Amino acid sequence: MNLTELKNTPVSELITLGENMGLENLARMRKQDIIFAILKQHAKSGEDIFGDGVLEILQDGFGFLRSADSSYLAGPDDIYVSPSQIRRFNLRTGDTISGKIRPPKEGERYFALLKVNEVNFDKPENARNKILFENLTPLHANSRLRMERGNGSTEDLTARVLDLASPIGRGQRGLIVAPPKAGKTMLLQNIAQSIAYNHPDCVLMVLLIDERPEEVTEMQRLVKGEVVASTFDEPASRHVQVAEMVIEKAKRLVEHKKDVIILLDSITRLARAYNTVVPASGKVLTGGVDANALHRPKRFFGAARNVEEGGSLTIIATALIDTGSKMDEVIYEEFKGTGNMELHLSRKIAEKRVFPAIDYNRSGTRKEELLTTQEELQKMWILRKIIHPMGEIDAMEFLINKLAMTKTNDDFFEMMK
Amino acid sequence: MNLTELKNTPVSELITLGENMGLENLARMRKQDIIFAILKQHAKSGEDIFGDGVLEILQDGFGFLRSADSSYLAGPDDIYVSPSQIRRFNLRTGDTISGKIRPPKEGERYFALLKVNEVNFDKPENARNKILFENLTPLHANSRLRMERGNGSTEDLTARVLDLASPIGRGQRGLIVAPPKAGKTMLLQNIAQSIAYNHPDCVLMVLLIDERPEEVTEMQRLVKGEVVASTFDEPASRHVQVAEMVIEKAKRLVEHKKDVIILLDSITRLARAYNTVVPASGKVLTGGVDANALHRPKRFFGAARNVEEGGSLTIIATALIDTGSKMDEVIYEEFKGTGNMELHLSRKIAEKRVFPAIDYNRSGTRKEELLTTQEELQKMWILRKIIHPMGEIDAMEFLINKLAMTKTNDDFFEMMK
RNA sequence: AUGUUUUUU
Ligand SMILES: Nc1ncnc2c1ncn2[C@@H]1O[C@H](COP(=O)(O)OP(=O)(O)O)[C@@H](O)[C@H]1O
Ligand SMILES: Nc1ncnc2c1ncn2[C@@H]1O[C@H](COP(=O)(O)OP(=O)(O)O)[C@@H](O)[C@H]1O
Ligand code: BEF
Ligand code: BEF
Ligand SMILES: [Mg+2]
Ligand SMILES: [Mg+2]
């Protein structure tokens, strides 16, 4: 008796099971209400019920166990967590809790937690003694997260160009700067697919705030990982809540020496949401940005770091420029002094239908010698010195024509000499 | 005895009928008052009266049935809908209701609804069980909505250029960016005529907010569809109300697997209206735009989506640029990074009296391979690569001179090779 | 109202 197991079951089988259990007509009923009635009827027989979810401690002291399939939205099937157990096990926002639950009695509206069985997918004896995320020693990117497929596919050209322009390692904090209508969607899809193919052990999390739902359901059915999104039909409060829950879960996972990867596509939208939810202080800067509005996105971005004791946190955010709004322009570069990695995309190259439209000149990675060998770094330096004199479109055409001849970049580097 | 039937009748016949029924002199009376008196006299004999309209639920709990011929304006002949029936049939704003009505008794001012016969042009048993619009899975444009006439007319050149620049499919969410005095009116007229000619099965709705009455009555007598407009003589409150009613009706139609097409021509004017009706919060951004003013137009724009279960919602809005106001430059923009189709028009080409004055270079459609075949996409790519080096005016002249030689674009593509 | 917008290189 698990909550996620009943959530994955279809509607027809749940209706059939409820009709066999002998309850009210479930055809004219919601799936969540059907599951609730089935759990009630199964607990009336004396059997136990189990559930799971991410903890969201409220300001009063209690909390609930949000579900991932609903993008951490307030649902009727949330498991109530008393503050006594929180104080007894030192629980915090983001801790994954899995234990026995019971249906609400007369006068209650949510399931109660009796005994916790597993904390953060581990024993509670290992979670009671742990080092906080704020005390971990940061470090630079040491492990190399190669994005090249290696299967010789035609779509691998984007990953090869990305590796030649800006290699990505564990704990990297980069930025994907690109004007609208440049190809950010396809680039993010390719990055997510390459991460899921090359490094399936890492925890991939794609955050899409204030996006077109069709794109949400497309990304959810395309990438092999977790997708937490919030369409534009929701207020900025839900955006802030989702961002906080995601970053808290990422911190709790990193605290257990896990490799978390966050592919953010709405850093600008997140900053707009934070500027909308912040109370007015009577002081407005140039472009309509509050003085204390960028602090929360600043911390959300800076949360990414590489841990020496174990694990890492990678955050790749895509910033929006040339959107016609001065607020986004002020945000983007305020954040430019940030992202230890900038991958610029050119609109002029995208208009020529030359995919990918990557600005190789302005791209780059700091401390790239820690992720590449000596000969590889020398070859990349020679390639950059050869590409720099040529124009952007000409350099992109040259790179595409030279990478189409071979499958691996090593052969291209060997033929360049 | 139908309301719309009496509304379509002329004034002279209604006056004659009222004089034959033996009532007060109807020559010095309004047509609506004449219809009201005729309905009263016909109901005094014991016969039944029927009406219809779009439901507009008020904040208190009751509602009225607005009429389409009055642009959903508050009229004396609105049918009152009690909240009891709303609670009994789960009615919402936008549901088309058609049932028996009765004249108001002593102390009443509006017609009452006794029994509902048809809901959303369908049986109530099919409307009681339905999936909300917020739960439908979005998708990209799959079905091709070809705009080419095919009759070899001289006006078909605009549709041919539009198809070669940006093909339109079901569920598309585009933008027509053009400075003033460019030819937006003729272009919108041609688009509406091509939609009514090629795809007469789709529900066409043209929304004109804050425009001149002459243009309104011109569009109403030119296109073959529904025209809901609101001239500048009305406050922004009526603009917001009309936009809400139109989008709610569109959502209710899409919920019944219908293909709705909305040709918006005032996205900038709608954003200005929303910025005017929003209460001041003491925080003004660059250009005079409120922080929470663009949220409602953002949702109105993002409502457009393609449904996998059935139906679609297409919204083609025309944004205004270079109007001398910085608010529109932020308002029209901020919207640039939202849609997935931009059809730019050049003022320099319009000054040369070269119609249509379309910027073929900056135009385009994302995921265009889902609406065109392989050979068609290759021919469009070759045409774009040939047109790109030439200047805007030169490319437009070349395209016009090459399309004037033949009737179909297939012959042009075959002759280009 | 100052900042924002005006405003840019
Ligand atoms: N690698 C690519 N190959 C082919 N087309 C692409 C590629 N990247 C982008 N595009 C085209 O650009 C359009 C928009 O790209 P997108 O990633 O949505 O840009 P952004 O996210 O910056 O708005 C897509 O619909 C696609 O047709
Ligand atoms: N396809 C066309 N053919 C001929 N003249 C046109 C065409 N499109 C626009 N025009 C001219 O431009 C004028 C204004 O066009 P309009 O569509 O009103 O531009 P906008 O809507 O951008 O203000 C029209 O009065 C018309 O004379
Ligand atoms: F319009 Be893109 F997604 F920035
Ligand atoms: F003056 Be146009 F209608 F934009
Ligand atoms: Mg995008
Ligand atoms: Mg116009």
Side-chain angles (χ1 to χ4, degrees):
Chain A
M1 301 300 299
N2 185 270
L3 221 175
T4 61
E5 296 179 1
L6 272 64
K7 290 296 299 180
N8 296 328
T9 49
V11 185
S12 60
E13 278 185 302
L14 288 180
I15 292 179
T16 305
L17 199 276
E19 292 179 1
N20 287 271
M21 293 305 298
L23 299 179
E24 196 179 354
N25 300 330
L26 312 93
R28 299 178 299 270
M29 289 185 60
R30 296 170 59 257
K31 180 180 178 180
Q32 299 182 359
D33 302 0
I34 289 175
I35 294 181
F36 185 72
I38 290 180
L39 291 181
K40 288 186 60 180
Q41 186 65 23
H42 201 262
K44 288 179 180 180
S45 301
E47 301 281 8
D48 303 330
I49 306 180
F50 299 92
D52 55 76
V54 184
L55 180 60
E56 177 189 347
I57 294 184
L58 276 307
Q59 190 178 2
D60 300 331
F62 61 90
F64 300 93
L65 299 185
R66 287 294 189 269
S67 180
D69 65 331
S70 300
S71 302
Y72 297 151
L73 184 58
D77 299 332
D78 294 0
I79 293 90
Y80 171 79
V81 181
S82 60
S84 60
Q85 299 179 354
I86 299 179
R87 226 182 37 184
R88 197 213 158 78
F89 297 92
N90 292 113
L91 303 180
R92 297 191 303 180
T93 300
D95 296 323
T96 301
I97 302 300
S98 303
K100 183 182 301 180
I101 58 179
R102 63 174 180 86
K105 301 180 182 301
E106 313 187 58
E108 293 177 322
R109 299 176 58 180
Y110 297 89
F111 293 78
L113 181 61
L114 294 318
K115 177 183 178 181
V116 47
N117 302 330
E118 192 175 17
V119 180
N120 295 299
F121 307 96
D122 199 1
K123 302 180 181 180
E125 287 74 15
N126 301 21
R128 54 183 294 183
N129 182 22
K130 62 184 302 180
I131 303 180
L132 304 183
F133 181 79
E134 299 81 9
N135 304 329
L136 304 177
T137 62
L139 275 186
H140 297 272
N142 301 331
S143 181
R144 171 63 183 274
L145 295 181
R146 190 170 305 275
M147 301 289 297
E148 174 177 327
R149 289 294 197 88
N151 50 16
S153 180
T154 175
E155 299 294 335
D156 200 12
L157 299 179
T158 301
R160 292 165 66 179
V161 173
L162 184 139
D163 294 330
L164 295 184
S166 62
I168 303 180
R170 301 189 186 273
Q172 187 68 201
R173 178 177 60 258
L175 278 175
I176 306 299
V177 181
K181 204 181 179 181
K184 304 179 303 300
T185 301
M186 287 297 301
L187 190 141
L188 203 279
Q189 291 180 1
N190 183 269
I191 286 187
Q193 291 181 179
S194 300
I195 290 180
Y197 185 83
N198 301 20
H199 306 272
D201 58 330
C202 300
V203 181
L204 180 58
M205 301 178 61
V206 181
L207 181 59
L208 306 178
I209 296 298
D210 194 72
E211 338 238 323
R212 314 104 132 272
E214 42 265 89
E215 302 177 2
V216 169
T217 185
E218 174 179 27
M219 296 299 300
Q220 187 176 357
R221 298 182 177 181
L222 185 137
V223 307
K224 208 282 181 179
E226 193 185 277
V227 179
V228 182
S230 181
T231 62
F232 53 87
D233 297 325
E234 309 303 85
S237 301
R238 180 175 176 176
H239 302 345
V240 174
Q241 181 62 220
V242 167
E244 290 303 83
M245 292 299 299
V246 168
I247 192 59
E248 287 292 337
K249 181 180 181 180
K251 290 180 180 179
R252 295 302 93 88
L253 289 181
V254 171
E255 284 177 340
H256 288 268
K257 300 180 180 60
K258 296 297 182 178
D259 300 330
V260 185
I261 298 180
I262 299 180
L263 299 183
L264 179 58
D265 204 5
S266 49
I267 174 62
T268 302
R269 307 301 179 179
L270 187 63
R272 283 189 169 187
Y274 274 112
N275 183 87
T276 306
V277 300
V278 57
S281 59
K283 297 176 298 181
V284 180
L285 279 71
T286 301
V289 185
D290 192 6
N292 302 331
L294 299 180
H295 173 249
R296 304 285 295 274
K298 203 69 167 298
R299 297 192 61 179
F300 178 81
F301 203 13
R305 62 183 61 178
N306 183 21
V307 183
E308 184 179 2
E309 291 77 9
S312 59
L313 180 59
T314 302
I315 294 181
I316 301 300
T318 73
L320 284 311
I321 64 172
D322 304 329
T323 60
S325 180
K326 299 175 297 299
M327 177 172 56
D328 303 338
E329 179 70 290
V330 173
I331 293 170
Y332 137 72
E333 220 159 87
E334 120 82 26
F335 284 158
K336 181 179 181 180
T338 328
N340 29 90
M341 168 181 296
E342 293 78 11
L343 186 61
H344 298 271
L345 306 187
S346 179
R347 179 184 294 183
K348 181 182 301 179
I349 308 179
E351 292 180 358
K352 207 181 180 181
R353 301 303 177 182
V354 181
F355 291 87
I358 302 180
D359 197 331
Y360 196 91
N361 297 330
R362 303 207 302 179
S363 300
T365 302
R366 303 187 181 187
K367 301 300 180 180
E368 58 181 356
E369 65 280 354
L370 300 181
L371 301 177
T372 57
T373 61
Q374 180 180 0
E375 58 279 356
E376 182 179 4
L377 180 59
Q378 180 180 0
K379 293 168 179 179
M380 290 181 177
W381 181 89
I382 295 179
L383 182 58
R384 282 187 169 271
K385 291 305 177 182
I386 294 179
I387 285 181
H388 181 269
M390 300 181 301
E392 300 180 0
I393 303 179
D394 301 330
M396 289 308 299
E397 293 179 359
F398 168 81
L399 182 59
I400 292 181
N401 295 17
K402 289 303 178 300
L403 294 184
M405 299 298 299
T406 176
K407 297 183 179 181
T408 61
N409 307 12
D410 192 9
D411 301 330
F412 163 76
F413 279 159
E414 192 71 18
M415 291 299 300
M416 284 302 300
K417 300 184 301 179
Chain B
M1 301 300 299
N2 185 270
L3 221 175
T4 61
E5 296 179 1
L6 272 63
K7 290 296 298 180
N8 296 328
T9 49
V11 185
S12 60
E13 278 185 303
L14 288 180
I15 292 179
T16 305
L17 199 276
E19 292 179 1
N20 287 271
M21 293 305 298
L23 300 179
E24 196 179 354
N25 300 330
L26 312 93
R28 299 178 299 269
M29 289 185 60
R30 296 170 59 257
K31 180 180 178 179
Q32 299 181 0
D33 302 0
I34 289 175
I35 294 181
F36 185 72
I38 290 180
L39 291 181
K40 289 186 60 180
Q41 186 65 24
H42 201 262
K44 288 179 180 180
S45 301
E47 300 281 8
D48 302 330
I49 306 180
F50 299 92
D52 54 76
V54 184
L55 180 60
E56 176 189 347
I57 294 185
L58 276 307
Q59 190 178 2
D60 300 331
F62 61 90
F64 300 94
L65 300 185
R66 287 294 189 269
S67 180
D69 65 330
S70 300
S71 301
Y72 297 151
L73 184 58
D77 299 332
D78 294 0
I79 293 89
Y80 171 79
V81 181
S82 60
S84 60
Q85 299 179 354
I86 299 179
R87 226 182 38 184
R88 197 213 158 78
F89 297 93
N90 292 113
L91 303 180
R92 297 191 303 179
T93 301
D95 296 323
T96 300
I97 302 300
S98 303
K100 183 182 301 180
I101 58 179
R102 62 174 180 86
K105 301 180 182 301
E106 313 187 58
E108 293 177 322
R109 299 176 58 180
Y110 297 89
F111 293 78
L113 181 60
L114 294 318
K115 177 183 178 181
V116 47
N117 303 330
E118 192 175 17
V119 180
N120 295 299
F121 307 96
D122 199 1
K123 302 179 181 180
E125 288 74 16
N126 301 21
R128 55 183 294 183
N129 182 22
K130 62 184 301 180
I131 303 180
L132 304 183
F133 181 79
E134 299 81 8
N135 304 329
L136 304 177
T137 61
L139 275 187
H140 297 272
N142 301 331
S143 180
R144 171 63 183 273
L145 295 181
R146 191 169 305 275
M147 301 289 297
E148 174 177 327
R149 289 294 197 88
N151 50 16
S153 180
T154 175
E155 299 294 336
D156 200 12
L157 299 180
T158 301
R160 292 166 67 179
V161 173
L162 184 139
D163 294 330
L164 295 184
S166 62
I168 303 179
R170 301 189 186 273
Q172 187 68 201
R173 178 177 60 258
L175 278 175
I176 306 299
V177 181
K181 204 181 179 181
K184 304 179 303 300
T185 301
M186 287 297 301
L187 190 141
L188 202 279
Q189 291 180 1
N190 183 269
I191 286 187
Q193 291 181 179
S194 300
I195 290 181
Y197 185 83
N198 302 20
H199 306 272
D201 58 330
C202 300
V203 181
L204 180 58
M205 301 178 61
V206 181
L207 180 59
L208 306 178
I209 296 297
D210 194 72
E211 293 288 67
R212 301 175 178 88
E214 42 265 89
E215 302 177 2
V216 169
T217 185
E218 174 179 27
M219 296 299 300
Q220 187 176 358
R221 298 182 177 181
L222 185 137
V223 307
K224 209 282 181 179
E226 194 185 277
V227 179
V228 182
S230 181
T231 62
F232 53 87
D233 297 325
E234 309 303 85
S237 301
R238 180 175 176 176
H239 302 346
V240 174
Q241 181 62 220
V242 167
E244 290 303 83
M245 292 299 299
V246 168
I247 192 59
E248 287 292 337
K249 181 180 181 180
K251 290 181 180 179
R252 295 302 93 88
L253 289 181
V254 171
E255 284 177 340
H256 288 268
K257 301 180 180 60
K258 296 297 182 178
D259 299 330
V260 185
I261 298 180
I262 299 180
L263 299 183
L264 179 58
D265 204 5
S266 49
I267 174 62
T268 302
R269 306 301 179 179
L270 188 63
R272 283 190 169 187
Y274 274 112
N275 183 87
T276 306
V277 300
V278 57
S281 59
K283 297 176 298 181
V284 180
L285 280 71
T286 301
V289 185
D290 192 6
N292 302 331
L294 300 180
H295 173 249
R296 304 285 295 274
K298 203 69 167 299
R299 297 192 61 179
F300 178 81
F301 203 13
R305 62 183 61 178
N306 184 21
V307 183
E308 184 179 2
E309 291 77 9
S312 59
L313 180 59
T314 302
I315 294 181
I316 302 300
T318 73
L320 284 311
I321 64 172
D322 304 329
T323 60
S325 179
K326 299 175 298 299
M327 177 172 56
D328 303 338
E329 179 70 290
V330 185
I331 272 192
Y332 121 79
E333 242 141 9
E334 117 86 56
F335 284 158
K336 181 179 181 180
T338 305
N340 51 26
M341 169 181 296
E342 293 78 11
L343 186 61
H344 299 271
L345 306 187
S346 179
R347 179 184 294 183
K348 181 182 300 179
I349 308 179
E351 291 180 358
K352 207 181 180 180
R353 301 303 177 181
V354 181
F355 291 87
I358 302 180
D359 197 331
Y360 196 91
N361 297 330
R362 303 207 302 179
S363 300
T365 302
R366 304 187 181 187
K367 301 300 179 180
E368 58 180 356
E369 65 280 354
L370 300 180
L371 301 177
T372 57
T373 61
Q374 180 180 359
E375 57 279 356
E376 182 179 4
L377 180 59
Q378 180 180 0
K379 293 168 179 179
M380 290 182 177
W381 181 89
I382 295 179
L383 182 58
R384 282 187 169 271
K385 291 305 177 182
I386 294 179
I387 285 181
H388 181 268
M390 300 181 301
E392 300 180 0
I393 303 179
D394 301 330
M396 289 308 299
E397 292 179 359
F398 168 81
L399 182 59
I400 292 181
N401 294 17
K402 289 303 178 300
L403 294 184
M405 298 298 299
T406 176
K407 297 183 179 180
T408 61
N409 307 12
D410 192 9
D411 301 330
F412 163 76
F413 279 159
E414 192 71 18
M415 291 299 300
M416 284 302 300
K417 300 184 301 179

